[PDB]
Subunit: 409 residues, 4 copies
């Protein structure tokens, strides 16, 4: 086990190293505790939900098991966070379909969130259903298919409004559609006009902003839908800005070499807010667990340096069933927090002045030196201050949870 | 030398092959006639211009030489086209800088365009000048630098309005800025806010759309400016939609594997018009001569299939000084025209129906068969009908122009 | 329907256009006749095989798959080959991958003989309980390695037997899924286990006239994204050092990577290639091959540099969203017309112009050739080999749909 | 200025944190000492050289360039090496690339001995009238080919001489620009011309104790985008078959390509690697090396699989927008701290966990190690080797600017 005295000693020296270069480590930690991460429920049960019943043991099979697993992960993540629901995580003994869901079907999660002390975000479920016709939903050329998914869309807003009212925290309602073509399309225009019309119909009925606002998630390509995506990043950025809604940036859904941290400063002169879905793509939209890599470092430092956190909701989105599913959440959440914290531990005001004076020598030297400053000592202090295990130690908690809970399922 | 009667005969056979699948070759050729390509003047003199005085022989060094070279290229490109000027192509014996150019400095090109029977598009020159400070111009942190380039931007609009008034054809005034950083920036927000404020000042003074409209050209990266581009594709699409201006898509300026033909149908539900700069990137923004490849085939078929040509200006943008510079124009122009014509020779209405009906088997079979239909016979007929040489034959014209003009320089 | 005399007339005009630039269309069509494509059997039944239990009409039995391949080959002009997978064994004896016998392929030998096609082979190193954590031949578990080495050796014995019976060398292609989903600690040891296992598999000598092995690398696959044990570098090195063939699958490389670049860097050192034409759409998606930059460059790089006599061309794709028989024909025809376009260029003169650094002539002529009447030569090739021209083969597909594919699911299996 | 006591206190805590997970920080630092980086001379003078006559203070003479490399090496902890180019010959004699003599490098042999560093070498096959249509050794023109083959042979004679005088093997790296701007018709013949020419260059036997050749491929370059005669495949094949070294330049591969994948596919067949660490930003841009995914993966792949003893690590970048001496130090320190972080992992235990398919433990530990106190071990290494800690070496740069660079 890490000795708390070692943490305190390392922190006192780190505090002085940072103070020497004009950085306040105590202030950086206060800034970090103001950034809630929206932990996605679907990593716990391989996106099965409850509506329509070499993988690691101990998958959650019930609301109680999934709630318990999220409680365990949150207990190992320092600070206070949020949970993202999917529509298929409805808890009810009533026979429901996606077009007949009712807000009270989420009373279970409202009660859980109040007891756990977390806010809730929402996702409509526009996949894994017989009404998905040729990979299309809201923007299907089939009117019956459109109407079914438009009803689910409107219901996602009603559920979100209800949750937001009960919780007293705004529910970000994220729309992701699979709609697209496997092979090269003739008509790229009409599907996007069908999408535009359908989305306008979904958001028409006004709901209190204090309770919910919608975000729209584009994708470049998906398995079986490689050649064309109706809901493109350009379509949704244009839609978000014109309809005054949020734009969802999923770090896994762009071109090879594409840096999503570039988009923030091109959006905020025109738009309202972002839902930043941190996700690790490995050569495709693979939904690997978020790790501390160039992409995460750039996302977190671009939000911190340019002051966009107050208008950017950070959500996790990944699905890895090859490892302990509770551990997956903690790895991704801690990777995101330590990357935000490293960005907050820079003399940003002074680095900005140096850059304004075109002192590119100083900027290169200092940014490179900061990568080996004692940021880990500040992160360890943050973990310890918030009653979470330091470094390797939380593996003990996972091993105990496996023995007592997961391996017994 | 190809025989006119044999071109006519091969056309009659192709006309019947196409008629049998519900395609009218005469109507396809009439559609191609209505698509003017904006031929860039700067390929003729390696972007030297006239304002501020190993490779293929015969570079143009004077207005008369460049005017003559463009006349020769257009004489080998069938139909009616346009020419793009840069501000540095001003023709005047007065001492000028970029912030003191006057509309009359382009009387030479107005007079030439009238005689040649072509319209003119325009480009402000925001590069190769001592006032480019650390690769920044309009969005420089230095107010003196900003104010200089804002004067040039306003002047570009005044010139463009004057040319448009004199020719009775709208001048598309294209803005490209090099502004960015070689290495990783601290502040991505402020440069883009400086750009937004400076562009708004440039376009403030009202001018009639009849004479001129501005287009905004983004870039991912350039040589010596690799890490950050102030004027991003997202920034300019947002800017164009917000300020009711045109958006410039340069085929060479996107990510590896990025398909710019995807963007049109995501723009036109929101925006006014496009300036499509066809350009061949080979692994970077290399500005190779446009050839008939996947990118050009996808750009041209996406414009004709979805009916965007009436709102899309097509310009050439490439620079290859390793080959006959006049030949470079004709290769690129002809590649673009035959690609448009091939797209126009598809049974688009029936293919759209098959696709709406999810007959993806029919769509794959027919689109693949069409690639080996006799589109060549229709292209040859188009060349001959418009008094240009067929196939290899225009090499004789290039060899004669080399002997008589280029090799004597 | 296109009229034969019209095809004949357009061909005469095309022949003259090409003759005027020093290209012989009759000779180009004779050259294309000599390039057999190895049509992959597994597109017909979604890689199910017969060993282990969306568009209509999937093949469910040997006779159904044989019929579907016959139908596809009847619409592809010229003489071709078929690739088998080990799981396409035909026997009532209970078999595992480590107990297959050469005679289990007598069904396919007899079919190939009467169809007039050669056979290529693929060992099956996937969809089996003995795939342990995505690893087979190069598993750290010696019991798993030993099982897959037994299958490897058997693939060679089967291939040797088929080659003996057909009197045509069987290319026996090895593809392993082996790798990691996430970032590995040890990249060296898996590749040493792979090297040792492959050397054991190829140890027993078999006559080259009957069979030779090819080795197929991959950059990444679904659920194995971060590390592939059998990399392109590993297998190019392995093929050259062990004097075997190297398999290049056009879908298995980096974004923007041009596999047509590899041939001329391999052939100064190596024996031969198995070129697997496949269309990747932003990942290893196994789309049907179409006439695109990649196929045009692969085919023209093989033709221009004279590599066809040392390069086996196979198809590898899997699209079950469309008529599975039509999938084969689209891909085969796209590959043939792309080869034919490359053969219809004044290659000797273009080479001389390039050696003289006349890049102007090279650019103008290569661009003009893209709109020469290559279609008229392709149509003539189709007609001469008793296959429908242009859109016409859709009639054949529609007939096969009514008669076979739209009924098949209701037909008793046997 | 950082207090040595702050470095010592942080180090003692770091040493305990690493010991608790089976990692010896003292041993990790001893391992790092054994990895010399070959510092490229051409960053100091924008690849001008002396044979054929932006931030202030460019080196313009051999003494200025030598002084600048001394200054950079004084701020990089441990013992390293310097890479020369043929155009850095120091002689009063009129030379061309085909008439250089070994003693034209006596200046650099003497400097290397005084400095206490080994020397690697690069033939110069660019920026010369005899570069014809972007081709040199593999030109279709026999006059061009023969000129560049002579330079190739001389590069080996020079390398052998330097190696004999220093008592340290000179890696002689070959990079050719040869290729086409636009799409070629014949891809085969250029590569056969290259094969024959390289075989002629390496024909005359020279002692391996003095020098060995390495061959550097490229995917594409400016004005040569469509085809590169000397491809990565061509040179890996050539190195393995002719028993020479293969040069991997981190800036010269495809978008998303991980050059750290190549080592374990090479070493079952090949002799050795020259690894050129270089940062590409969307093309072969030759940016200063920084601690990024590419550098982290390169360094940890060499450390984890035990390839350092068969892998020469060289720097290759050119950034004239910043202090050129600082450029060397940023790049060298980034490479060293990345090697050190890789050396500070419980590699033997992580390998066992991975063999047992415990991918949960592997993910958790590799992520935790990224925020272990690796910086405290790096600072101790800097201090132990008499170099400034953290931001402090900027004082040295500012003093060197004041006293030397800005006075030029
Ligand atoms: O809704 C959960 C996620 O499911 C994946 O399949 C989609 O690609 C989106 O990333 C989405 O956010
Ligand atoms: O090596 C794995 C172990 O490392 C120790 O340092 C931790 O306290 C945990 O017990 C963990 O399970
Ligand atoms: O041709 C048969 C197919 O026709 C399409 O129009 C239908 O959508 C189904 O895909 C059906 O199986
Ligand atoms: O809903 C299932 C149907 O999906 C279509 O796309 C397939 O082509 C088949 O017709 C299938 O029966
Ligand atoms: O339009 C589709 C049809 O085109 C005709 O030209 C073909 O002969 C086939 O009948 C095909 O089914
Ligand atoms: O010769 C020094 C370096 O110069 C660059 O221009 C080349 O691309 C190679 O990377 C070479 O190693
Ligand atoms: O202004 C002419 C052109 O110059 C350069 O190519 C720029 O990258 C951009 O494409 C611009 O349009
Ligand atoms: O076995 C047939 C094929 O199956 C999969 O597509 C593999 O990725 C590989 O391409 C192999 O050749
Ligand atoms: Mn997402
Ligand atoms: Mn995803
Ligand atoms: Mn442009
Ligand atoms: Mn460009
Ligand atoms: Mn394959
Ligand atoms: Mn594949
Ligand atoms: Mn290099
Ligand atoms: Mn480089």
């Amino acid at each position: 086990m890490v000795k708390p005295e070692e943490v305190d000693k390392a922190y006192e020296v780190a505090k002085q190293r940072y103070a020497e270069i004009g950085v306040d480590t105590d202030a950086a930690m206060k800034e970090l505790e103001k950034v809630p991460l929206s932990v996605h429920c679907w990593q716990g049960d391989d996106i099965h939900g409850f509506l329509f019943p070499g993988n690691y043991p101990g998958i959650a099979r019930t609301p109680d098991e999934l709630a318990g697993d999220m409680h365990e992960a949150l207990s190992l993540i320092p600070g206070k966070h949020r949970v993202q629901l999917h529509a298929i995580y409805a808890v009810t003994d009533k026979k429901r379909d996606l077009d007949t869901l009712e807000p009270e079907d989420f009373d279970y999660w409202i009660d859980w969130a109040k007891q756990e002390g977390v806010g809730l975000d929402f996702n409509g479920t526009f996949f894994s259903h017989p009404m998905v016709k040729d990979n299309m939903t809201v923007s299907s050329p089939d009117p019956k298919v459109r109407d079914f998914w438009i009803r689910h869309g409107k219901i996602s807003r009603e559920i979100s409004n209800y949750i937001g009212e009960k919780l007293g925290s705004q529910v970000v309602n994220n729309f992701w559609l699979p709609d697209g073509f496997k092979d090269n399309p003739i008509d790229k225009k009409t599907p996007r006009l069908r999408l535009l019309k359908a989305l306008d119909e979904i958001i028409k009925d006004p709901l209190p902003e204090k309770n919910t606002i919608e975000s729209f998630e584009g994708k470049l390509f998906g398995t079986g839908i490689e050649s064309y995506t109706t809901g493109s990043h350009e379509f949704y950025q244009n839609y978000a800005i014109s309809r005054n809604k949020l734009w969802t940036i999923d770090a896994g859904h762009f071109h090879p070499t594409e840096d999503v941290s570039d988009k923030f400063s091109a959006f905020f002169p025109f738009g309202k807010g972002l839902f930043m879905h941190v996700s690790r793509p490995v050569r495709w939209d693979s939904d690997h667990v978020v790790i501390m890599d160039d992409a995460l470092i750039r996302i977190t430092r671009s939000l911190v340096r340019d002051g966009y956190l107050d208008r950017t909701h950070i959500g996790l989105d990944f699905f890895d069933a090859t490892i302990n599913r509770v551990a997956a959440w903690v790895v991704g959440a801690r990777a995101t927090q330590k990357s935000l914290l490293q960005a907050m531990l820079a003399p940003i005001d002074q680095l900005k002045k140096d850059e304004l004076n075109a002192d590119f020598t100083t900027r290169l030297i200092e940014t490179e030196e900061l990568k080996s400053f004692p940021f880990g000592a500040v992160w360890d202090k943050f973990c310890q201050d918030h009653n979470t295990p330091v470094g390797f130690d939380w593996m003990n908690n996972i091993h105990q949870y496996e023995k007592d809970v997961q391996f017994k399922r």
